[PDB]
Design a protein around this ligand. Structure first.
Ligand code: COA
Ligand code: BTI
Ligand code: CL
Ligand code: CL
Ligand code: MG
Ligand code: ZN
Ligand code: ZN
Lengths: 119, 564, 129, 259, 129, 46
């Protein structure tokens, strides 16, 4: 409703861009990283950070690109972080209607077009 | 310094008079417990990668002779000493033996011998094995402790017959593993040992040994085992163990209480951890008792203090082992290897994973059918362990037909039958999966080998070196063709380097430093390092020596720093 | 968006000497309205990471976050008269004292350790079972 | 006052000792622990050799009389504190039998593995009926420390006196101590292992190593055998005394000088 | 003035992995007219110093300095077509060359000087009157 | 290097020669560290 906290389901420059707008607006922020982006600055440039694509709940060690395109994980870190909204940035998920219906099968506000327009 | 008088007659004179059989009966009959000092072989094998040099070992033999003339024997040859001495110390193991024999004419000299291949690295024909035993006897060994890494008696017979044929003591060892008091591992029960003892006696043993290579025998078990052993055979029993667990001295004392005829220990400075338990303290515990061995504790201390100063020169070869480890009961890695191993794990970025290993080793051991693990079988089980660790694999994972696993060569080789046969046989499926169409066999590996043409073989080594080789050198060449060849070439380049003191052999001479060096008994060189030049172009360094007063310049490449 | 930078002397590796003015970089932030301009300067400044020399960053943040600044109620006398921009008592405070230990041991070593063997590097941390 | 705070702070069992086994010097502490209602374990320090008649000052009667007198003084437990690891297996069998016939209090045996056979003495004490023993986790055991807890427990596994401690957990806990101990590389001694030489000089677990370092640094790291005999000799000159904590330091000061 | 950057990923020390996007930074250049924007971009691009890794800077500079770009007559087939390889020209790297010389003579000496008398130690540099 | 392109160069240190026989000279160039590796021909190294 009143957006307090945004998770950016992406990386690098796109993630940093969204972080900046979030900050200036007083919105708190959440970054995700795969293990290969262990060192990436976008995971430090957020007020909170979580790994995506490894661990006890998996069931395979995930890929570096895969890790970012994974609905389950994205939702997971959204739900665990306490995120009211997700910005998908561009590429990756951002045009996946599956991922949208999921934001809101999880009641999480999706920054972008409704799933119908998307299909 | 000891001593003024000549030397007291000891077990050496006793064996010469009685012969081996009557001599094992005399051991059996003795009230006092008998002691073997393993400092000169197993102590540094376990603690210093077997890098102890002849120089330090031979200078002490005469003191053992005058100060502890009641010792049963000095274990001082075989195990890894044979090839290590030439490969890594550029010295000849025969010369080592002949010098120990000269300095302690009153004590038995003992070696560890693998039945299947003597001191070698692979399988050899019977005649070669025979030839080795004959030379070892000629060169001073009195007591051969002979073992098989799977406790397969069949695989020991040729060695046992060759020892008796030479009229030496044949001590046939049984490797201890598992736990006779735990009924959940029935394959190594009491009966397992007493039946081997009886097979070994029928095969001609003069003495039976229990070789607890991993330090696994616990005191309540020693009491049961040594009682039962000395009821199942009339032969003397000789107990060798390792202190990995930190309680092996309790096991030895339990064994002595139970009637054991002889035991092994290392001098204090080279005992504990993966070595034998402490000689001076075991002696001190028995002092005044019924079985008192009569060894002077003030001499043991003095010889220990000498070994402590010797050990300090070998800092390059110390491991990181800090003390007792009861996880030996879980993994059963033999003391003689829990360190060559500790740093195969290093060389593979496993150092911080070293525990999961431990558990892979017990697991691997069991998938193999649960076997005796001792040089080279442990090696095989280690290679399996590291691999289940690296390639991150489990045992169903290892025996499943679907999952490709390329096996370590040592594992392929064992399953083929190159180390022999466990009682047992190898697990079918694992064998088929690992062999990749290579065909296994189940007979004694020795018995497949063609006789060596000993003449042809002698001429090959002789043509290569362009001189005659001695009988001893020829035995060396049979065991390790390539390591002997390189040693012979290095000797011809560098001279009798075994005669240098240890700090000089490993580090050379400081500026201005003086050294006495015996090129031979009674030919002493005085050598002073006067100065060492800056390296030149063409990249040569000249070292200015004084040799017996006279200046000598020697030029060497400066390999350190890139010069040819 | 809406950040201009005009560098003076700073980059990764720069040598800053004591002889001239102490400027590293001027930051300019733009926006359609004045408040949003302030939050953009504020976001930019806090995001700076400058290692090797101390900087005035936290003072600049206290200037632009201050209420008299935000509702344009300040005069030329504002800074000279506003003590809580200059918050000054030697700080500490648990974390600060802890940083001070680590600083000091990092630069100077620990007397009990500094002349003695060192543990094998990248050693396994102890893991509680 | 200090004993009071220590009980308040969470100590339940006070092993109290005196460096000359002087009972008179233990009374005040022993009364203070009983007034706090905690356990007072009165320790007798072990020295010499009860099976050797050449040193009759420390015979069997000396320990059994002190046990009876510690009981009278209020002990709830008697400990044998073998700070140099001198008690031998055969002596343990005589000593713990005789102590348990001389007092009805339980006995608690504490020893050091300097000789490399303390585990034998411990297991002989358990067979003789000792009520409790001390041991260190494997990674911090051996040499001048206590003997190995995992191996002692494994040796008693399934016997009548089995202490019922899980071997898998002991090993996991010792693995943890092992990693801990690696971080302290700065403070490792040069001691490599068993030294039967302890039976001559009697330097206690703390001191043996310090004393060796201190004779290296005072440039005698080459006449250690003269020091060893000296410390033994000094001990006799002082009248044959219990050498622990401060009293051993005094003996080592004396020994270093005479050398 | 007129330059916007959208970066954050690169900085000295950073390690570019093979796994993701090759992107280092996005440069946006603004000016009142398009020609001035081109030369703003051109100035900023050429002002970049990136070392340790290869870049596409030269190729970016060639595009924007192209006549077909300047007069807006390119189709989508321009890059796949123009080259006009563009492509190339190398780099002098003179400093590194000099340092190589100095290190070589410092370690090995000069062949014309190395076995001949040597000037009196730290004698005065010549001073130009 | 040219009229109006002045390099400042400091020789910080010179390493002992290594095996493979290389010496590295540590420079500062315009403030920035630079390592250069040269054979130690003097003293026999390729
Ligand atoms: C572009 O340079 P190039 O063709 O590789 O080689 P150059 O011959 O200009 O070598 C120049 C080197 O000298 C130094 N240099 C370049 N311009 C400089 C200047 N104006 N002032 C001082 N030093 C300078 C730099 O290290 C430079 O490397 P760069 O390419 O990062 O600027
Ligand atoms: O936060 C305030 C920065 C502006 C004041 C510092 C300036 S920079 C140039 C000038 N020369 C100085 O000595 N100080 C001022
Ligand atoms: Cl991927
Ligand atoms: Cl070989
Ligand atoms: Mg007997
Ligand atoms: Zn052994
Ligand atoms: Zn203690």
């Amino acid at each position: 409703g009143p957006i307090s906290k945004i998770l950016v389901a992406n990386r690098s420059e796109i993630a940093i861009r969204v972080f900046r707008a979030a900050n200036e607006l007083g919105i708190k922020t959440v970054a995700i990283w795969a293990e290969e982006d262990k060192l990436a600055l976008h995971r430090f440039k957020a007020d909170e950070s979580y790994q995506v694509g490894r661990g006890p709940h998996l069931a395979r060690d995930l890929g570096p690109i895969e890790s970012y395109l994974s609905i389950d994980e994205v939702i997971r870190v959204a739900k665990l972080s306490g995120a009211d909204a997700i910005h998908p940035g561009y590429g990756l998920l951002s045009e996946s209607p599956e991922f949208v219906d999921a934001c809101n099968k999880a009641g999480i506000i999706f920054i972008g077009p409704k799933a119908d327009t998307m299909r | 310094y000891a001593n003024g008088n000549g030397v007291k007659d000891g077990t050496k004179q006793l064996l010469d008079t009685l012969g081996p059989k009557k001599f094992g009966e005399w051991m059996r009959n003795e009230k006092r417990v008998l002691l073997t000092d393993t400092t000169m072989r197993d102590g540094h094998q376990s603690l210093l990668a077997t890098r102890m040099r002849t120089y330090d070992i031979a200078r002490i033999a005469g003191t053992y002779s005058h100060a502890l003339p009641n010792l049963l024997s000095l274990e001082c040859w075989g195990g890894a000493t044979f090839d290590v001495s030439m490969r890594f110390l550029t010295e000849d193991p025969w010369e080592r033996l002949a010098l120990i024999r000269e300095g302690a004419p009153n004590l038995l000299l003992q070696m560890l011998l693998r039945g299947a291949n003597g001191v070698g690295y692979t399988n050899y024909p019977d005649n070669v094995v025979k030839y080795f035993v004959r030379q070892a006897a000629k060169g001073g060994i009195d007591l051969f402790r002979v073992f098989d890494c799977l406790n397969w008696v069949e695989n020991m017979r040729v060695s046992m017959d060759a020892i008796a044929e030479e009229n030496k003591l044949c001590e046939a060892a049984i490797c201890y593993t598992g736990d006779i008091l735990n009924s959940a591992r029935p394959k190594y029960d009491l009966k397992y040992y007493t039946n081997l003892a009886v097979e070994l006696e029928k095969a001609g043993a003069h003495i039976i040994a229990v070789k607890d290579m991993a330090g696994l025998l616990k005191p309540a078990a020693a009491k049961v085992l040594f009682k039962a052993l000395r009821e199942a055979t009339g032969l003397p029993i000789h107990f060798h163990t390792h202190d990995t667990s930190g309680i092996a001295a309790a096991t030895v004392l339990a064994a002595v209480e139970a009637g054991v005829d002889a035991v092994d220990a290392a001098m204090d400075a080279l005992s504990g951890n993966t070595s034998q338990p402490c000689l001076g303290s075991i002696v001190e515990a028995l002092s005044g008792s019924e079985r008192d061995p009569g060894l002077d504790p003030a001499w043991i201390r003095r010889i220990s203090f000498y070994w402590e100063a010797v050990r300090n020169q070998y800092a390059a070869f110390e491991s990181d082992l800090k003390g007792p480890a009861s996880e030996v009961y879980l993994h059963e890695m033999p003391g003689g290897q829990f360190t060559n191993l500790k740093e195969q794990a290093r060389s593979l970025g496993l150092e911080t994973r070293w525990h999961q290993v431990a558990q892979a080793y017990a697991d691997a051991n069991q998938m193999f059918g649960d076997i005796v693990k001792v040089a080279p079988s442990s090696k095989v089980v280690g290679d399996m362990a590291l691999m289940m660790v690296s390639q991150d694999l489990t045992v169903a994972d290892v025996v499943s037909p679907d999952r490709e696993v390329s096996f370590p060569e040592s594992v392929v080789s064992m399953l083929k039958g190159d180390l022999g046969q466990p009682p047992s046989g190898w697990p079918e499926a694992l064998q088929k999966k690992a062999l990749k169409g290579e065909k296994p066999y189940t007979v004694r590996p020795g018995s497949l080998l063609k006789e060596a043409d000993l003449d042809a073989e002698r001429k090959v080594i002789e043509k290569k070196l362009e001189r005659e080789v001695s009988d001893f050198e020829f035995a060396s060449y049979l065991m390790y063709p390539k390591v002997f060849t390189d040693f012979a070439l290095a000797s011809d380049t560098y001279g009798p380097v075994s005669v240098l003191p240890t700090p000089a052999y490993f580090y050379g001479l400081a500026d201005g430093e003086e050294l006495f060096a015996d090129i031979e008994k009674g030919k002493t060189l005085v050598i002073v390092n006067q100065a060492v030049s800056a390296t030149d172009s063409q990249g040569m360094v000249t070292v200015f020596f004084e040799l017996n007063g006279q200046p000598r310049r020697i030029k060497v490449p400066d390999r350190a720093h890139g010069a040819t | 968006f809406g950040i201009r930078l005009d560098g003076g002397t700073s980059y990764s590796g720069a040598i800053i000497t004591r002889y001239y003015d102490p400027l590293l970089v001027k930051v300019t932030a733009w926006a359609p309205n004045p408040l949003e301009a302030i939050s953009r300067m504020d976001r930019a400044l806090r995001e700076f990471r400058i290692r090797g020399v101390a900087t005035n960053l936290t003072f600049l943040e206290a200037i632009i976050g201050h209420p008299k600044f935000r509702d344009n109620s300040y005069t030329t006398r504002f800074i000279d008269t506003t003590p809580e921009l200059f918050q000054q008592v030697k700080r500490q405070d648990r974390a600060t004292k802890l940083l001070t230990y680590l600083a000091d041991v990092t630069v100077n070593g620990h007397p009990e350790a500094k002349d003695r063997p060192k543990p094998l590097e990248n050693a396994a941390r102890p893991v509680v079972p």
